[PDB]
Amino acid sequence: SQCSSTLVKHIKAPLHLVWSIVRRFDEPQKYKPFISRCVVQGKKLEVGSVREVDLKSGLPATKSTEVLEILDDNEHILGIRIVGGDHRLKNYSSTISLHSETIDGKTGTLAIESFVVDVPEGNTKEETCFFVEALIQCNLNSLADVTERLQAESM
Amino acid sequence: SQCSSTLVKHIKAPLHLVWSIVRRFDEPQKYKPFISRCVVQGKKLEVGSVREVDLKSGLPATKSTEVLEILDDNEHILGIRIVGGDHRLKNYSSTISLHSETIDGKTGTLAIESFVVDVPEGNTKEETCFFVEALIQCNLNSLADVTERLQAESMEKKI
């Protein structure tokens, strides 16, 4: 009836740098490959700020409206809830927490993204949820590439 | 700039049965899981015939317009081309063939499906193809499920 799943990604870059990008609720296109532009109505980073995402051309969907639900600069957590948009996903919530770990002897970040979303009418978990897992996996993969180029650029 | 890939499915049912379903160009609902309605204009399944597919509710796209390109009852090939719909898929074309096999001392069918589609611009092949492979793997796995249940039912009719 509803599907929750958790995606994990190891990143070869320092936590503060990774947070610096993740934390931008007004700039998801920073690393999310399917976003074209983003507009935040109100003060960009408060809990309750709505954003209006425009996806890129030639994808199944074109727009998404999302609400920032948690931004914790302390425990490094970011929660959103999608609330509208032509993708037709219903009741989607997603949290990304960021933990400090050590990868290949140097400092690194674990990304943990959880999400919950209703399985559409007439379709099974087995048909649907691997698409949502894929998108996020892709989103995290891109965060890694982006952050690591940034951490490499610093040298 | 183009996304090309082939998928494979080993199905535990006779070829006559799988083809029985797969050749149904007017009813991809029989096994494809996202499809709600299929209208076919004029001739049912003759090369050139077009189908308007309606997707089920709550999905990122609602309609697809596809064309029958190959229907071969003898060689067991079904080729289609998508030419419209709101999935925004550009130059999608797919083709599926069914082949007979004897594996583990029990008859069966290998299905093998190859697709080709344009990659959305401003996105890379890496970010986008696995999505198309996955949907097809999804249809293939479903085909095995549907087909194999039918075999089991038929084998239940043992008297």
Swiss-Prot record, chain A:
GO terms under biological process: abscisic acid-activated signaling pathway
Annotated site (Involved in ABA binding): P33, I80, V132, L135
A molecular function GO annotation: signaling receptor activity
Positions of short motif Gate loop: 57-61
Record site: Involved in interactions with PP2Cs: P60, T124
Keywords for this protein: Abscisic acid signaling pathway, Cell membrane, Cytoplasm, Disulfide bond, Membrane, Nucleus, Protein phosphatase inhibitor, Receptor
Annotated stretches, region: START-like: 1-148
Binding-site positions, abscisate: 32, 61-66, 88-94, 113
Compartments, as annotated in UniProt: Cytoplasm; Nucleus; Cell membrane
SS bond list: C3-C129
GO CC term (a single one): cytoplasm
Motif Latch loop: chain residues: 87-89
Main location: cytoplasm
Subunit and partners: Monomer. Forms heterodimer with PYL13, thus antagonizing PP2Cs-binding and ABA-independent inhibition of PP2Cs. Homodimer. Binds ABA on one subunit only. Binds to CARs protein in an ABA-independent manner, both at the plasma membrane and in the nucleus. Interacts with ABI1 and HAB1, and possibly with other PP2Cs, in an ABA-independent manner.
Similarity comment: family membership: Belongs to the PYR/PYL/RCAR abscisic acid intracellular receptor family.
Domain notes: Upon interaction with ABA, the 'latch' and 'gate' loops change in conformation leading to a tight dimerization and the creation a surface that enables the receptor to dock into and inhibit the PP2C active site.
Function comment: Receptor for abscisic acid (ABA) required for ABA-mediated responses such as stomatal closure and germination inhibition. Inhibits the activity of group-A protein phosphatases type 2C (PP2Cs) in an ABA-independent manner but more efficiently when activated by ABA. Can be activated by both (-)-ABA and (+)-ABA.
Protein name: Abscisic acid receptor PYL10
Protein species of origin: Arabidopsis thaliana (Mouse-ear cress)
Phylogenetic placement of the source organism: Eukaryota, Viridiplantae, Streptophyta, Embryophyta, Tracheophyta
Gene designation: PYL10
Shown stretch of the complete protein: 25 to 179 of 183
Swiss-Prot record, chain B:
Highest rank taxon of the organism: Eukaryota
Keywords (A to Z) from UniProt: Abscisic acid signaling pathway, Cell membrane, Cytoplasm, Disulfide bond, Membrane, Nucleus, Protein phosphatase inhibitor, Receptor
Gene Ontology cellular-component terms listed: cytoplasm; nucleus; plasma membrane
Gene Ontology process terms (BP): abscisic acid-activated signaling pathway
GO MF, one annotated term: signaling receptor activity
Site (Involved in ABA binding): P33, I80, V132, L135
Segments carrying motif Gate loop: 57-61
Disulphide bridges, residue numbers: C3-C129
Function, in words: Receptor for abscisic acid (ABA) required for ABA-mediated responses such as stomatal closure and germination inhibition. Inhibits the activity of group-A protein phosphatases type 2C (PP2Cs) in an ABA-independent manner but more efficiently when activated by ABA. Can be activated by both (-)-ABA and (+)-ABA.
Domain-level remarks: Upon interaction with ABA, the 'latch' and 'gate' loops change in conformation leading to a tight dimerization and the creation a surface that enables the receptor to dock into and inhibit the PP2C active site.
Family: Belongs to the PYR/PYL/RCAR abscisic acid intracellular receptor family.
Name used for this protein in its record: Abscisic acid receptor PYL10
This protein's encoding gene: PYL10
